[PDB]
């Protein structure tokens, strides 16, 4: 049964062609998010261990589920005639990073460093599990306002991580790298690092740097807010036009701008309470 194991509440999110409901699990009052996905609207399909053909999103969410809280946890899923239903563990109270930056403006570097660091660990976790998210952006990041813990959500554009070239893409265009714009190909890690550069500019300047293809491929980053030299260098490094010139995750986390990160609880105490 399905409508019997979850108390179902109101729609969640900003308002788009997607369907994610707030819910509570009757078994233990666990907050859940109940995501519906129409079969006719699914890009890539995968096969589970039982050979059961499921949306790739389900495959990817299973590979990253764990006690590491940087990534949304899939707790169960159900198939229905025209759709799949995903039961996700829902933190609360939460606000997504997009609304957070809109309400607060450009973030202090201390806060952006804690947030960026936690995103880095979450993406490293995905990659260690064989999963490429492909839609890293503030809209796909939830802030647990009480614990100060960030959460990567919506794996609906992801793929299995691989070392060869990708020629397809269904993520957010303004976060996609210039090699995707110019040649419709990319490699997964360096494209992720590019989106992390867009994300970090977003955090310290209050909005993304590029809106148009010409800016994305232009190789110029104007800073619209006061930003430290160290942070500017890291951002420009992540947004190197040539993929092989971008830093690895290790190089990002060893960057001098990234030292002395706050802990989640400290982050909540100093910046979210």
């Amino acid at each position: 049964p399905l409508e019997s194991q979850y108390q179902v509440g109101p729609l969640l999110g900003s308002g788009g062609f997607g369907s994610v409901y707030s819910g509570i699990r009757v078994s233990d009052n666990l907050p859940v998010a109940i995501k519906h996905v129409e079969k006719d609207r699914i890009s890539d399909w995968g096969e589970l261990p039982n050979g059961t053909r499921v949306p790739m999103e389900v495959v990817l969410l299973k590979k990253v589920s764990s006690g590491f809280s940087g990534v949304i946890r899939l707790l169960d899923w159900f198939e229905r005639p025209d759709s799949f239903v995903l039961i996700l563990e829902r933190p609360e109270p939460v606000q997504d990073l997009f609304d957070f930056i809109t309400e607060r403006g450009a973030l202090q570097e201390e806060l952006a460093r804690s947030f960026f660091w936690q995103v880095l660990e979450a993406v490293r976790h995905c990659h260690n599990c064989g999963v490429l998210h492909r839609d890293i952006k503030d809209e796909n990041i939830l802030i647990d306002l009480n614990r100060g813990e960030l959460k990567l959500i919506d794996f609906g554009s992801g793929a299995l991580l691989k070392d060869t070239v990708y020629t397809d893409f269904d993520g957010t265009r303004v976060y996609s790298p210039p090699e995707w714009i110019r040649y419709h190909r990319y490699h997964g890690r360096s494209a992720a690092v590019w989106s992390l550069g867009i994300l970090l500019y977003d955090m310290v300047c209050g909005d993304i740097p590029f809106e148009h293809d010409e800016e994305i491929i232009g190789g110029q980053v104007f800073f619209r807010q006061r930003v430290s030299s160290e942070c500017q260098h890291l951002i420009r490094w992540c947004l190197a036009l040539r993929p092989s010139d971008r830093p690895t995750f290790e190089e990002i986390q060893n960057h001098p701008w990234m030292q002395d990160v706050l802990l989640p609880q400290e982050t909540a105490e100093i910046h979210l309470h």
Binding site: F98, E139, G156, T172, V174, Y175, D207
Partner: peptide, 8 residues
């Protein structure tokens, strides 16, 4: 300046 979401 106009800040906006960007669908996938």
């Amino acid at each position: 300046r106009k800040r906006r979401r960007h669908p996938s």
